[PDB]
Design an enzyme around this catalytic site. Sequence first.
Site, PDB file in Angstrom:
ATOM      1  N   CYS A  65       0.742  -1.308  -0.043  1.00 16.54           N
ATOM      2  CA  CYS A  65       0.009   0.037  -0.079  1.00 16.54           C
ATOM      3  C   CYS A  65       0.802   1.276  -0.195  1.00 16.54           C
ATOM      4  CB  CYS A  65      -0.978   0.158   1.328  1.00 16.54           C
ATOM      5  SG  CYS A  65      -1.939   1.593   1.328  1.00 16.54           S
ATOM      6  N   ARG A  68      -0.111   4.557   3.002  1.00 18.69           N
ATOM      7  CA  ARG A  68       0.015   4.528   4.666  1.00 18.69           C
ATOM      8  C   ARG A  68       0.267   5.591   5.279  1.00 18.69           C
ATOM      9  NH1 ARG A  68       4.307  -0.318   4.674  1.00 18.69           N
ATOM     10  NH2 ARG A  68       4.545  -0.055   2.604  1.00 18.69           N
ATOM     11  N   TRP A 237      -9.460   5.907  -0.152  1.00 14.21           N
ATOM     12  CA  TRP A 237      -9.873   6.509  -1.500  1.00 14.21           C
ATOM     13  C   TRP A 237      -9.096   6.020  -2.596  1.00 14.21           C
ATOM     14  CZ3 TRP A 237      -8.292   9.800   2.423  1.00 14.21           C
ATOM     15  CH2 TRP A 237      -7.185  10.226   2.458  1.00 14.21           C
ATOM     16  N   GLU A 242      -5.814   3.216 -10.660  1.00 12.81           N
ATOM     17  CA  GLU A 242      -6.266   2.052 -10.337  1.00 12.81           C
ATOM     18  C   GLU A 242      -7.599   2.086 -11.351  1.00 12.81           C
ATOM     19  OE1 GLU A 242      -6.549   0.497  -5.911  1.00 12.81           O
ATOM     20  OE2 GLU A 242      -6.591   2.759  -5.693  1.00 12.81           O
TER      21      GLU A 242
END
Lengths: 362, 362
Positions: A65, A68, A237, A242
């Site tokens: 991720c 973070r 979000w 993506e």
Amino acid sequence: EEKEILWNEAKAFIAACYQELGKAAEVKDRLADIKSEIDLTGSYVHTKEELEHGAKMAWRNSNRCIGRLFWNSLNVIDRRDVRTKEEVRDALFHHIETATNNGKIRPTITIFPPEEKGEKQVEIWNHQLIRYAGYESDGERIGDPASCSLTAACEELGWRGERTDFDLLPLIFRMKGDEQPVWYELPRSLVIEVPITHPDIEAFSDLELKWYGVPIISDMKLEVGGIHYNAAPFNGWYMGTEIGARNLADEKRYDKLKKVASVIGIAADYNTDLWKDQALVELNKAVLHSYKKQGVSIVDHHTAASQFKRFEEQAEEAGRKLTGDWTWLIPPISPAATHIFHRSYDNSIVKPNYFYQDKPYE
Amino acid sequence: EEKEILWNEAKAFIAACYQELGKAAEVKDRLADIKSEIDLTGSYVHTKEELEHGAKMAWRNSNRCIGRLFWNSLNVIDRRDVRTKEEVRDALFHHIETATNNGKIRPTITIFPPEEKGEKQVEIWNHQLIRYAGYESDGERIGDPASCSLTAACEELGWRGERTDFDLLPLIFRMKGDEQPVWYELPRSLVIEVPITHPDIEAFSDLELKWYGVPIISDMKLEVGGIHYNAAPFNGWYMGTEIGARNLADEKRYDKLKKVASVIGIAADYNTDLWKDQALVELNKAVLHSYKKQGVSIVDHHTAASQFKRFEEQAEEAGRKLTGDWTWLIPPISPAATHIFHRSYDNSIVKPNYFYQDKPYE
Ligand code: HEM
Ligand code: HEM
Ligand SMILES: Nc1cccc(CCc2cccc(OCc3ccc4ccc(N)nc4c3)c2)n1
Ligand SMILES: Nc1cccc(CCc2cccc(OCc3ccc4ccc(N)nc4c3)c2)n1
Ligand SMILES: [Cl-]
Ligand SMILES: [Cl-]
């Protein structure tokens, strides 16, 4: 023998968690309470404070991720008290509403009762709480191919999709003891969607693309100190790539690059024209523009990588080791334009963390 | 003890090499010849056939190279007979000329005498045979920052650069026994360069960018059956992202994206405008257009990845294991638009191969 593993994980988790929370002195008594509880019951129950911090640690440890930096502001909703389908369903509905927050997305996790002795209490079948259905028969492609197997499972249970390219799948989950999952249509009033337009190219709307506001990942297991919360849906979000580089662009997903090339007015004939690259950039510009225009939170991969650089600096300043998965941290668009592409990361797995678990269906 | 390692590597190499060449029956006698030769001399000498095939295997095994479909057509030039600086220099000049081939780049390697007992016979200081100098003093940035240390080394040996952004470094190499390397200016008649123009945007030439035709990597060690050819410069043709996404784009290289944004007419103010991505695409379109317009070989990352898919299929059909380094195989532009991004690769090191070696300077 189950409880010997649990005791070890609990020692490591409580020590680290109370340490970070300035409660190191309370460590001793809390563990004794735990060792009695496990001897008697086979398990132990986290305090609100431990559950909240443990969910936050698990995000901080998610090697893959980039988001973070904001791990400590996760909004943790404790639903370990749920017992019925209506309560599960309503807590899932509430998660959608509170995490959406009229577009100002609030990173949220709802935690349901954990596995007892590896038997699940609630079993969510959705991959995300909000996601589009997908169909494949007789050479006809409709919707999201990633959703084909779940969509077919749902239509075995008496649901039926309108077979648009953007049917919302229903919530589907199974309760312990029950033998088929139930399903509930999502109230459309709770689901924000964003139509994709382009800032400069009016024809872009001819594609009639849209995506949903909030990605709420509902099929991973949260592990905190040896307790396995298999049902713990969470959301951030979106990072725009993506949607623009994967969901709408992949040949195995909506596969829209040739149509994007056409509406933006370039030929899609020669690799050397880099038309796929050019289309990818305009589609990703359209995604960011549309989310921002509608007032729905989103972040671009440059800002996201800048935030992640701050996370790396914060880790170092706090004396915590940084772990990361380079192959998932780099964005799929201009990766070498980010600092991530130019360093390496230790992919070690530390816990608390989020993990994959087998789907209940095929 | 040096010779025990050598014998083992030679057994593995000769067996595999003669096998691929259909000479398996000749394996037995050739190894006996080798074991005598090592006992007597401390080393052994490859046949022309073994040296050529071994150089080709080493390319086939280079996990980081997307260009390996063409491994078997490598043009191998055997210069193990070199003894003097003039012969080294002339063989380097010949490599440039024959590999350039008036623009129809011929993948070529020139092999010089190998390390004797780990003592080098010829020591090339250049990273590539053709490369631009770089300078840094008094806050003034000129040329290619990657070349700063070698450029400073060269200017200690009595060379002096014009301090344009595109000074050609001289060839610089040291002979065994000698104690300073010599240097020779490259004849400009042998060096093709490509000015960067854009197919559609006439203003792009205001940037006055150029790059050289042929990347001839001259600082890696070729290892074939235990023999260490530290001086074995080789070349392919460029993949366009190497110039457009790294050499001209990196902040630590020529750092041209803001100027590219300006000449293509977009603002460079907001991450969410994806101006860096858009600039990267137009610069990379300009690189491919310019090489093709001038008649110099080049390949785009889409065609290159398609060729690499064929290499993967060819490996499988031949029963050879495929190895690869995903982090180097994916291109830095639209990586998820290639099949590479969507699979994994075994990064095991098999030999023959090319390896890094310490630079002789700082
Ligand atoms: C707040 C905004 C957030 C952003 C922008 C963000 C960004 C991302 C992205 C882009 C990925 C996939 C990377 C790729 O495809 O290569 C990812 C993976 C992940 N994120 Fe985040 N994220 C955010 C919030 C969260 C939250 C709130 C959690 C949990 C509390 C979380 C946990 C993860 C995990 C576990 C993965 C990997 C999933 C897997 O292995 O399949 N993220 N994140
Ligand atoms: C014929 C056209 C060729 C193309 C288009 C090509 C493409 C590339 C590219 C783009 C890279 C760097 C990838 C990155 O930066 O992530 C690379 C690495 C490499 N290539 Fe090739 N290549 C070709 C020919 C050759 C030849 C002829 C050899 C040797 C005989 C070779 C051996 C290698 C090696 C060893 C590396 C890795 C170098 C390192 O680790 O620093 N390639 N190739
Ligand atoms: N070939 C390849 C190479 C590298 C990386 C990948 C992963 C692509 C992929 C597929 C499916 C899902 C996915 O992400 C899951 C996820 C989890 C949590 C998130 C939290 C917030 C947020 N904005 N996104 C999240 C996405 C990545 N594939
Ligand atoms: N952060 C990062 C992430 C992934 C990969 C990289 C490598 C960037 C890089 C730097 C320096 C050189 C380089 O490549 C060397 C090379 C060797 C042989 C070649 C043969 C033909 C050809 N066309 N190119 C070649 C390039 C890559 N960095
Ligand atoms: Cl998604
Ligand atoms: Cl280069």
